[model samples]
Target: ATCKAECPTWDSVCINKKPCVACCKKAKFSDGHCSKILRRCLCTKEC
Candidate 1:
């Protein structure tokens, strides 16, 4: 499954990757990343 959220802080080089991963982990997702254009956090897990 996949979940998405807005990132309060973001970077073009993904220096702020931690926030996305942290938020996703709290939601029980395996991993996550910040999308480039949308500046949204995308969390994913195997279903």
Candidate 2:
């Protein structure tokens, strides 16, 4: 499904998702979140 995933991160970009992907650590971007929606692990930073 489509979603407005407000990039809950920053300092990084959409790379991959084995069990979800990391948005960022410091910057924590917002505009990059809902950039797109894909069926993946959705690693929303277990950090």
Candidate 3:
């Protein structure tokens, strides 16, 4: 995972190129519940 304090810098690259999936029920955080359903890439941003 990569972290950047500014925009336009590449945040994260799914190098594997394989589709990743997540379930809301499996989310560890409260926000993850909504993110999972929304298919939001929260890996690089702070919500």
Candidate 4:
């Protein structure tokens, strides 16, 4: 998925069990992207 500045300020609808991926412009230090296999995932944004 592409990286965005923030969870789309717009609405979203997810139909899967996995957490939705968002760009999270609000993210303080790290850039947004899928977590590596060995790393933990954080809630960057919803949708």
Number of clashes in every candidate structure?
0, 11, 0, 1
- lDDT, candidate 3, 1-47, per-residue tens: 33312112223432321222132113322222113333333423234
Write down the worst ten-residue block by lDDT for model 2.
Answer: 25-34
Q: What is the C-alpha RMSD of each candidate to the true structure, in Å?
A: 4.1, 8.7, 10.7, 10.4
Q: Model 2, 1-47: lDDT tens per residue?
A: 23333333333434553112234223332222322444322223222
Residue 3 miss distance in model 2 (angstroms): 4.5
lDDT of 2 at 16: 50
**Clashes, model 4:** 1
Q: Per-residue alpha-carbon lDDT of model 1 for 1-47, expressed as tens digits?
A: 55455443434345477888887788777787877766567777766
Q: What is the C-alpha lDDT of each candidate?
A: 0.66, 0.31, 0.27, 0.35
TM-score to true structure, per model = 0.65, 0.20, 0.18, 0.19
- What candidate 3 gets wrong by more than 4 Å, as runs, is 1-34, 44-47
Cand. 1 Cα-lDDT: 0.66
- Model 4 worst lDDT run, 10 consecutive residues: 14-23
Over 4 Å off, model 2: 1-3, 18-47
- Which residue pairs in candidate 4 collide? 5-25
Q: Which predicted model would earn the best TM-score?
A: 1
